């Protein structure tokens, strides 16, 4: 199996196994994708699969400024232009449906309310907010409110609508964002979940919310078009779990029963060391993937974090992974696939232009000279 050869992820056919990782860019003010966003995605449409930046299912689920959502009619219309452009270049694309949970700020919340979370525990994290004078800034996340079961019922509805919106927007499917210390992970991990109801305590209970979201999304659009991103040991957004193995093995066992399109795994600290660990024992990725496969899981296995060309080729050849997702490399390289194919040099990413702004450091990264 080669990195550059076609794959299948549920009902979604991919021209190759080079994937564009989801990348929050904060360039859709008013939660609506614009013409510049459409250009940015079109440039990268040679990717076998594009996973969009995080796109929240609600304003409640928004944690960062100028992030395109799926809850406005105008946003749906804006995404349709993005998906039409990607498809015209023969690409494929899935929306990363998002809910940030406690990673948010009152200024972004409806009614300036408290961000929502399974337990009222404030993250020591930061979000990207825009001042009235336009300047972007990083600010401490706000105090969260503990969700009730009714709140949870409402969020589940927002997922159904979100998924429905993505289909209406012309997306090939969705990736459920269950990674990087956001809402779903907040339920999953012990440092964020101190609930005493059916959503707290045991592994089964902590995974309950994740599985409801998956079942809700898949019911709406098809299991064959539903994927999910996981990050077993990431320290992103002040989150921690002492026993990731039993928890995460149990999760993929359940996902293995659900005929999903893909499992997308952040290996290690998100944007950090691949060999990061939480708790006493190092995470066992082979045992993890085995739990998925052994439960019957046929989803395409997409791995991410700190991969380069050679390691990506070897990862796929060995059969450890089915496909590789690149984040920063795809920021810097619209034509990343061609460059990898021909082993051409790669542009360096400009970290100061990751978030907010305009075309600079977004749509002005050069393609190869041809
Ligand atoms: C600017 C930037 C924005 C990101 N936004 C998201 C996001 O919205 N959702 C997500 O799941 N991961 C996001 N990530 C994480 C990446 O998808 C990926 O996990 C990380 O960049 C490590 O991959 P890499 O070594 O290929 O760059 C973001 C990373 C960067 C650098
Ligand atoms: O802005 C960085 C970022 C990283 C991971 C996510 O899941 C979302 C945003």
Numbering used by the authors: 2 to 371
What does the paper say about this structure?
We determined the crystal structure of the enzyme NerA, which has been shown to exhibit dual ene-reductase and nitro-reductase activity with α,β-unsaturated nitro compounds, from A. radiobacter. NerA exhibits a TIM-barrel fold typical for OYE-like proteins, and all catalytically important active site residues are conserved. Residues stabilizing the electron-withdrawing group (EWG; e.g., carbonyl, carboxylic acid, nitro) of a ligand in an ene-reductase-like reaction are a histidine/asparagine pair (H178 and N181). The putative proton donor residue is Y183.
The previously determined apo structure was used as the search model for molecular replacement. Both soaking structures had one molecule present in the asymmetric unit. The overall B factors were higher than in the apo structure, and the overall structures were identical to the apo one. Like in the apo structure, weaker density was observed for the loop β3 region in both complex structures. The electron density for the soaked inhibitor 4-hydroxybenzaldehyde allowed fitting of the compound with the aromatic ring placed parallel to the si-face of the FMN isoalloxazine ring and the hydroxy moiety bound between residues H178 and N181. Both compounds were found to exhibit typical OYE binding modes to NerA.
